Amino acid sequence: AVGACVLCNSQTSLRCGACIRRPFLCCKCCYDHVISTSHKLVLSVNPYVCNAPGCDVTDVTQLYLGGMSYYCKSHKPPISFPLCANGQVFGLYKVTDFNAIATCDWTNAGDYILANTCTERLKLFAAETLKATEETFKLSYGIATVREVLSDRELHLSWEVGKPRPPLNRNYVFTGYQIGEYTFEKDAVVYRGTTTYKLNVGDYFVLTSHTVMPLSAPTLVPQEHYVRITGLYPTLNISDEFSSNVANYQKVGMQKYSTLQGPPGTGKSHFAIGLALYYPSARIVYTACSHAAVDALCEKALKYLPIDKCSRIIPARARVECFDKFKVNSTLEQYVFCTVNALPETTADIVVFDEISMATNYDLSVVNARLRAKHYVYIGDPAQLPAPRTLLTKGTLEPEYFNSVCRLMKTIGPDMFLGTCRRCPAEIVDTVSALVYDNKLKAHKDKSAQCFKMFYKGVITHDVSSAINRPQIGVVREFLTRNPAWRKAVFISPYNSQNAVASKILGLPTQTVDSSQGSEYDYVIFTQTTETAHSCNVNRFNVAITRAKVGILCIMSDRDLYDKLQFTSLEI
């Protein structure tokens, strides 16, 4: 009922009744908002509505204070003050960007650009508003009632009329009813339920929308710079394997927070785990948005850090299988590995947050709200894939706008930059170096002479918005007969439908460019499928070709990215 202004902190009884988040606005800022937007409902102890019986006047501009009550022009008593006067909405204790965040639908890229260029308190309001909007949008899709069951990985569904059909990919997790979360893949659909329950005909699914909690802590704490390493105690006996990062581990102790831009295979998990061997007394909470990224940190920690002092935090509502080698849910262990949504309310000497391009400003704030740390380290790469923004359909979101950390890495540069790629053949390293790294990524390996590119547009068929290019999978099939060493390759494409087809025709294991992020394969076969803005995204293209250690075959649709690939060209 009584709080502080989300724009200038001035205390107030006023909240905008028309904002989806009902932000507390002060007398001055509340006016500047109601007078510039369709938002005219103002909430105090009592709402600002005409007290006259059955009068439906709720617009604060058309209301007045008569005695200690509120009335419109038609019912105001002789002695009355217009609620809107002198640039103020009457309340207690007596902005252009705030209006755009309050009224936007989050479908344009300029909406996300603003949610990142604004003040710190408006970044939290934007994050709070966007997530609530994203969640209410989930209520606006049709229910799937089972019509029949084929096998243990197949069934047929009956969709709700009038309400749309949502996309079928692991990117949209349904919730069955209460028989666990379920996923689907294209008349015979594949049912992938978290719980092994014999699919009941008639049982229905619903996209589980969660309550959006208010954000309190900033996306980034205020930066502090120190004269010496603070609260952390370094070893002088620091393993030669981690000698390359000694200087950067010292920068970590001489700042409140630090940003590390680590391109593919430059030593991000090495840096993260080596930080624990450099400050061995220090308690480190390892966080990431995805379970796969918290597990990738676990696999590196298993190798270099004592298994007893490690704990893998697993949320009680167990969704997908994760890391099984640490003691589970021991919040007090020196090394805690946990996803941002499952983070407990604790403190740490250092907090490492990896895969920073996948974080949102909502995630950044949750991290600063649940973990109080001496030091914060943000590891990732703004040249890699960001979190998918389900409501965004108009315009492409640039890296400086993924989150506050990525904004810093693209504007002032990262504090630390891992510049030598030790995974990829020089053909791949030189290509991504020129494409997204300003020629600052260096190749540790030589050219493998196993990196091929083929310009083949083929034929694009659509299965709803997901694309398939059978002539591109046919060209791969031809290639494999003549290059049987490529039998061990992972098939990568920007579309799951293209992958579903290539899995049946080639038999190769399948990965979307997005699900391949953080992983490495000896050989990669990539079919671009289409020459759309999705498949031609340079961040997605960067992740696509940097998965390969030994060889890559790129069947290209785009003349632009094909001409940018520094690979051996193939004919057919």
Ligand X SMILES: c1n[nH]c(-c2nccs2)n1
> Going by C-beta distance under 8 Å and a sequence separation of 6 or more, which residues neighbour residue 226?
253, 254, 255
Q: Distances in Å between the alpha carbon of 97 and those of 54, 102, 127, 221, 524?
A: 36, 9, 14, 22, 45
Note whether 103 binds ligand X by CB under 6 A: no
Closer to Zn ion at the Cβ: 38 or 196? 38
Note whether 8 binds Zn ion by CB under 5 A: yes
54 assigned ligand-binding residue:
no
> Going by C-beta distance under 8 Å and a sequence separation of 6 or more, which residues neighbour residue 312?
294, 298, 322, 323, 324, 325, 326, 327, 328, 337, 338
* Residue of this chain nearest to ligand X (CB atom): 267
Candidates 174, 227, 232; CA nearest to 203 is 174
6 binds, among Zn ion, ligand X, none (CB under 5 to 8 A by kind): none
Q: Which of 57, 122, 322, 421 binds Zn ion (CB under 5 A)?
A: 57
Minimum CB–partner distance for residue 524 and Zn ion (Å): 49
Stretch that binds ligand X, among 21-29, 33-41, 265-273, 433-441 (CB under 6 A): 265-273
Note whether 364 binds Zn ion by CB under 5 A: no
Beta bridge mates, 146: 157
Q: Which of 39, 75, 131, 270 binds ligand X (CB under 6 A)?
A: 270
Q: What is the SS3 assignment for 214-271?
A: CCCCCCCCCCCECCCCCCCCCCCCCCHHHCCCHHHHHHHHCECEEEEECCCCCCHHHH
- For residues 380 and 218, give the distance between their C-alpha atoms in angstroms, rounded to a whole number: 19
Burial class (CB in 10 A: 0-12, 13-18, 19+), 37: middle
Give the SS3 label for residue 372. Answer: strand
- Binders of ligand X among residues 502 to 541 (CB under 6 A) are none
- Binders of Zn ion among residues 18 to 37 (CB under 5 A) are 18-19, 26, 29
16 binds, among ligand X, Zn ion, none (CB under 5 to 8 A by kind): Zn ion
| DSSP state letter for 299 | H
Show the tokens assigned to 118. 């604004």
Closer to Zn ion at the Cβ: 68 or 412? 68
Note whether 546 binds ligand X by CB under 6 A: no
Note whether 266 binds ligand X by CB under 6 A: yes
- For residues 432 and 548, give the distance between their C-alpha atoms in angstroms, rounded to a whole number: 12
Note whether 262 binds ligand X by CB under 6 A: no
303 assigned ligand-binding residue:
no
Burial class (CB in 10 A: 0-12, 13-18, 19+), 496: buried
Q: Which of 36, 244, 329, 346 binds ligand X (CB under 6 A)?
A: 244
- For residues 524 and 488, give the distance between their C-alpha atoms in angstroms, rounded to a whole number: 9
Note whether 445 binds ligand X by CB under 6 A: no
DSSP for 406-430? HHHHHHT--SEE--EESSS-HHHHH
Note whether 52 binds Zn ion by CB under 5 A: yes
Note whether 155 binds Zn ion by CB under 5 A: no
- Binders of ligand X among residues 121 to 180 (CB under 6 A) are none
Minimum CB–partner distance for residue 268 and ligand X (Å): 8
Stretch that binds ligand X, among 79-87, 183-191, 259-267, 554-562 (CB under 6 A): 259-267
Note whether 267 binds ligand X by CB under 6 A: yes
HSE-CB for 309 with a 13 A CA cutoff: 15
Q: Which of 7, 127, 284, 525 binds Zn ion (CB under 5 A)?
A: 7
- Binders of Zn ion among residues 90 to 149 (CB under 5 A) are 102
26 binds, among Zn ion, ligand X, none (CB under 5 to 8 A by kind): Zn ion
Burial class (CB in 10 A: 0-12, 13-18, 19+), 135: middle
527 binds, among Zn ion, ligand X, none (CB under 5 to 8 A by kind): none
Show the tokens assigned to 571. 């004919």
Note whether 547 binds ligand X by CB under 6 A: no
Give the SS3 label for residue 212. Answer: coil
266 assigned ligand-binding residue:
yes
270 assigned ligand-binding residue:
no
5 assigned ligand-binding residue:
yes
User: Which residue in this structure is represented by tokens 């992972």?
Assistant: 490
72 binds, among Zn ion, ligand X, none (CB under 5 to 8 A by kind): Zn ion
17 assigned ligand-binding residue:
no
26 assigned ligand-binding residue:
yes
Closer to Zn ion at the Cβ: 66 or 315? 66
Show the tokens assigned to 63. 């209301």
Closer to ligand X at the Cβ: 267 or 494? 267
322 assigned ligand-binding residue:
no
CA angle, 204 as apex, 200 and 205 as ends, to 5°?
A: 120
Is the sign of the CA dihedral 136, 142, 145, 149 positive or negative? negative
User: How many chain residues bind ligand X (CB under 6 A)?
Assistant: 6
Note whether 398 and 532 are within 8 A (CB): no
Q: Which of 265, 382, 414, 458 binds ligand X (CB under 6 A)?
A: 265
What separation, in Å, do the N-terminal and C-terminal C-alpha atoms of the chain show? 71
- For residues 421 and 547, give the distance between their C-alpha atoms in angstroms, rounded to a whole number: 12
275 binds, among Zn ion, ligand X, none (CB under 5 to 8 A by kind): none
75 assigned ligand-binding residue:
yes
Q: In one letter, which amino acid is 558?
A: D
Note whether 157 binds Zn ion by CB under 5 A: no
Give the SS3 label for residue 91. Answer: coil
Note whether 72 binds Zn ion by CB under 5 A: yes
Candidates 493, 563, 561; CA nearest to 526 is 493
Binding-residue pattern over the window 404 to 433 for ligand X, x denoting contact by CB under 6 A: ------------------x-----------
Minimum CB–partner distance for residue 359 and ligand X (Å): 22
Known binding residues are 5, 8, 16, 19, 26, 29, 33, 39, 50, 55, 72, 75, 262-269
| Residues binding ligand X (CB under 6 A) | 244, 265-267, 270, 422
| Residues binding Zn ion (CB under 5 A) | 5, 7-8, 10, 16, 18-19, 26, 29, 39, 50, 52, 55, 57, 72, 74-75, 102
Known binding residues for a ribonucleoside 5'-triphosphate are 262-269
Known binding residues for Zn(2+) are 5, 8, 16, 19, 26, 29, 33, 39, 50, 55, 72, 75
